[PDB]
Amino acid sequence: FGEVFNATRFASVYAWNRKRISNCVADYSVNSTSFSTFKCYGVSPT
Amino acid sequence: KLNDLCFTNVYADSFVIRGDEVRQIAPGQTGKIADYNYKLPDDFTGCV
């Protein structure tokens, strides 16, 4: 996550950046960095 | 339509909070504010 939301630059919206994730162990509460929007649709963020 | 009623056990919950977290207070919200400082029941009945 660290470089995933905190790096030098993200690509544009039409030319967007995709990343592939699996084979790990996750957390949602590592919110600590202020998020002006946090919406989870179809599954509870809790 | 409130003034048409005879209410029961009226409680006014007072505090102050930042303008960047106005939307955080509602019956079924989550996040640091509404989980660690205040909390609203999910069957709430009252005015904000």
Side-chain angles (χ1 to χ4, degrees):
Chain A
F1 321 108
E3 88 285 0
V4 181
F5 64 91
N6 187 11
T8 180
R9 163 221 41 72
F10 286 101
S12 188
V13 57
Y14 64 92
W16 42 276
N17 189 92
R18 180 263 186 186
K19 187 169 73 75
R20 174 56 179 57
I21 311 93
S22 50
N23 273 288
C24 59
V25 148
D27 192 26
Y28 68 94
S29 57
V30 276
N31 61 314
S32 62
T33 33
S34 247
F35 284 155
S36 61
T37 298
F38 193 34
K39 311 299 173 293
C40 292
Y41 293 100
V43 58
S44 297
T46 63
Chain B
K1 193 183 289 183
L2 293 175
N3 282 326
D4 297 331
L5 277 298
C6 196
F7 304 73
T8 315
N9 296 295
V10 187
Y11 291 92
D13 293 334
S14 302
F15 57 90
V16 296
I17 193 66
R18 280 181 54 71
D20 283 321
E21 293 82 3
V22 176
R23 213 200 53 184
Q24 181 59 75
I25 302 298
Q29 282 277 341
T30 176
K32 55 162 68 71
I33 314 302
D35 301 358
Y36 308 138
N37 302 262
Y38 202 80
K39 204 264 184 185
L40 269 174
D42 309 69
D43 50 355
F44 177 77
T45 298
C47 307
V48 173

